[PDB]
């Protein structure tokens, strides 16, 4: 619950000749995945830093990768209009999903559901069936294209981190929220552990980092911001709650990993993560590890203490 990274990372898979777009931790297995810009994804153990396997088949840069409840069926997406559903243990593509009109920015999956969210450069969010790959629903109403998507854990609302300076919330359009200057770059649904704690800081509750060097904690029911975390040097590329719920974990294009204790509007930790911009970020569900994938074409894992 108090998992906050110490000075030096132990190991990192340096086997990339292209930048890293997303990094995510496997739920069950002690491994991590990383999508790169060379139309490839790499899967390897985080406890040793030895390459294990790779997913290939895309034609353009892979922008996102994730896991279901226990790894097993993976879902990746690449800017050549493509989404792909893979078997993790086999590291083989089993389904190819198409039907957009532009590149794809981000993807996610309900961990124990049967559908896929996809965020597309043509100003929309596509809902797909897992087994068929047929666009069961299409959500539109944006001015500029979408940067990220994330579903509610209860499968009722979808948060869309747009490029319209706004973050929207959509009924599976419930509302729109706007308290930023530049592009909003990432979102994350809050866990129950923060629910009481957030009441002390001042739902459902959302987090949103933006290109304006800010992070903001927002609420659906009121549409007004609760909290405004400031002090960022450059654009925020990641906003993740902590499992304990007291802490906010975020990364930005400034060579800094920031860990905030939102209870009293302080910056708990500022870690010199990389020598260039941090593109993506994730935390393991239970294990004391946090992964940062950076513009250095590297993916560094920090043990937590």
């Amino acid at each position: 619950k108090e998992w906050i990274p110490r000075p030096p990372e132990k190991y990192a898979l340096s086997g990339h000749r292209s930048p890293v777009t997303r990094v995510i931790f496997h739920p069950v297995f002690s491994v991590m995945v990383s999508a790169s810009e060379d139309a490839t994804i790499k899967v390897w153990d985080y406890e040793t830093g030895d390459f294990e396997r790779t997913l290939k088949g895309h034609t353009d840069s892979v922008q996102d990768i994730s896991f279901d409840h226990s790894g097993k069926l993976l879902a990746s997406c690449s800017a050549d209009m493509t989404i792909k559903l893979w078997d993790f243990q086999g590291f083989e593509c089993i389904r190819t999903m198409h039907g957009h009109d532009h590149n794809v920015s981000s993807v996610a999956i309900m961990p124990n559901g049967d559908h896929i969210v996809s965020a597309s450069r043509d100003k929309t969010i596509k809902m797909w069936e897992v087994q068929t790959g047929y666009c069961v629903k299409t959500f539109t109403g944006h001015r500029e294209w979408v940067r990220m998507v994330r579903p509610n854990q209860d499968g009722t609302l979808i948060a869309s981190c747009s490029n319209d300076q706004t973050v929207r919330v959509w009924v599976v359009c419930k509302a729109e929220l706007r308290e930023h200057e530049h592009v909003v770059e990432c979102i994350s649904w809050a866990p129950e552990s923060s629910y009481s704690s957030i009441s002390e800081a001042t739902g459902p509750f959302l987090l949103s980092g933006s290109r304006d060097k800010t992070i903001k904690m927002w609420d659906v029911s009121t549409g007004m911001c609760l909290m405004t975390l400031v002090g960022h040097d450059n654009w925020v590329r990641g906003v993740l709650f902590h499992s304990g719920g007291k802490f906010i974990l975020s990364c930005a294009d400034d060579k800094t990993l920031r860990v905030w204790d939102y209870k009293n509007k302080r910056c708990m930790k500022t870690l010199n993560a990389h020598e260039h911009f941090v593109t993506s970020l994730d935390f393991h569900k239970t294990a004391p590890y946090v992964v940062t994938g950076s513009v250095d074409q590297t993916v560094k894992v920090w043990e937590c203490r």
Binding site: T59, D60, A79, D80, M81, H102, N103, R121
Partner: protein
Amino acid sequence: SLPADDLCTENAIMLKRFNRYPLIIDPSGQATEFIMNEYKDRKITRTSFLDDAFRKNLESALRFGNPLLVQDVESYDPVLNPVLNREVRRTGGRVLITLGDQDIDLSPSFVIFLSTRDPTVEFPPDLCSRVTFVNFTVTRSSLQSQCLNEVLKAERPDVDEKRSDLLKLQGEFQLRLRQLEKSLLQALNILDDDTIITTLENLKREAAEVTRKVEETDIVMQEVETVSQQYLPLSTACSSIYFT
């Protein structure tokens, strides 16, 4: 139908190698037929900014990669500014060019040509930087050659036809000799097999066909002395009078 001189050849090479699209200044109209023949196989069309169908011709030129000839460009529609700027956006397998009305797909290689008929045109500012000029001017050598060809064709059909056929033969001889040397490089890229020996004896036979050219240069030194000695003042007067 390009002329035979340095200026038109410099323009012609300017009309095959380029980075910005070219702007040809044509006092005569020869460059029009030159571009008409150069890209004839591609179904190169021609239009003008004043033409009502300018935008449709433009759209076809980008979409199907077919080059296009644009004339009368003092009245320049600046809608073509993004094209000259090499500003495009690509989505997977679709490369599009913005055009104001909307962004539309274009082929990897299309060539748009801008042509002027009045050399005194002062182009608008957007053309002061977005293109490279090409002067189809005429100098003393071109006019002298034209006058000599005209006078020989008009007075002396035999001399004109003889010199034309002989120069064509000489060009053929030089081209065939260099081609036959290149083919000898290609083959050599003897004692192994008879097939290699067989084709080379025909080339030594065509080295003898160059004896045919060694003899034909003595016959055209005979056509070119008569006209040169008998037609100095005509050509000199023509060039001097026209430039004065």
